[PDB]
């Protein structure tokens, strides 16, 4: 039993190219290798499945819907909120945040991590002597 299928309404992540990190909706299937994808901020276009990673999100739309119909369907299912709140979608956001930290911000994070590690190690020692 497979968990994810290519179908009309499936939300996919572009995993390669310039559009990497963007979410698109499969609105129609051309052939085994290509699908017709549409997003609120892009023109409807075809792309190969080799550049798509299917997600667990799936909106309820008909084949090749209008942009207004597509937009409301995504908002009704909270596609953006679900993706960003998910662990998979949060990974992409965190990677961008880490790369965007300046020198001063990295120094602050170092101090927080160093202090966090020191306290955690002390807590473990107590859990060792007591809960041996």
């Amino acid at each position: 039993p497979f968990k994810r299928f290519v179908e009309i309404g499936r939300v996919a992540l572009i995993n390669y190219g310039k559009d990497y990190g963007r979410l698109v909706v499969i609105v129609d299937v051309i052939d085994q290798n290509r699908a017709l994808v549409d997003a609120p901020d892009m023109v409807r276009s075809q792309m190969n499945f080799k550049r798509l990673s299917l997600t667990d999100i799936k909106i309820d739309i008909k084949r090749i819907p209008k942009k207004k119909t597509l937009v409301e369907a995504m908002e009704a299912a909270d596609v953006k909120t679900k993706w960003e709140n998910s662990s998979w979608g949060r990974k992409l956001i965190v990677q961008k945040r880490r790369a965007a930290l300046n020198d001063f911000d990295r120094f602050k994070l170092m101090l927080a991590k160093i202090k966090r590690a020191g306290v955690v190690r002390q807590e473990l020692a107590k859990l060792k002597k007591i809960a041996a």
């Binding site: 790369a99 965007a100 930290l101 300046n102 020198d103 001063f104 120094f107 602050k108 101090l111």
Partner: protein, 201 residues
Amino acid sequence: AKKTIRNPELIRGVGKFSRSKMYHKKGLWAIKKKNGGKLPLHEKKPVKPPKFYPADDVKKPLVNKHKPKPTKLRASITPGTVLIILAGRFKGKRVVFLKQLTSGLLLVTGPFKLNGVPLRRVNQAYVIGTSTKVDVSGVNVEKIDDKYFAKQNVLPQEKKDEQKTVDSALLKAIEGIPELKAYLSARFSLKSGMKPHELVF
């Protein structure tokens, strides 16, 4: 007399107004009237015996019309910017940028109290300008210049006091920003997996 330039430049070497427009703005038409319908004509602006004669005629180099221009200041570097030194004995230390001297070098301070870097000149090519800014409005370095770092060993007490006067005004600003004192007291370094071309400063 005229208070502002008549012909602003769209680009380097090209004025905004044409010759016909400039003739009106120059006022040559008005000057012609005041001089009997003619543009006034002006006039062109009007040893010891040698002790040794060289056998070979001396050769003098041809004229070069190119004149050096002042060293430019990187856009990332602004007064109060925190700089990272990349070379020398102070490599890796984070200092505060004060101003650019006439020679084109940058005037920086540790401050000396936090990291032991005094008022020093650092070449712009050997520093990285970060995004951290510390207020230096209360810092007065008008007395400092290139001659202040010129040779003519014990450091005279006069310079030590001068360091403290500039330093004191800067400590209060640094103390205002949390964790900024420790930031300026630690050297920058590259750890495993740290790619300089991806780091944001």
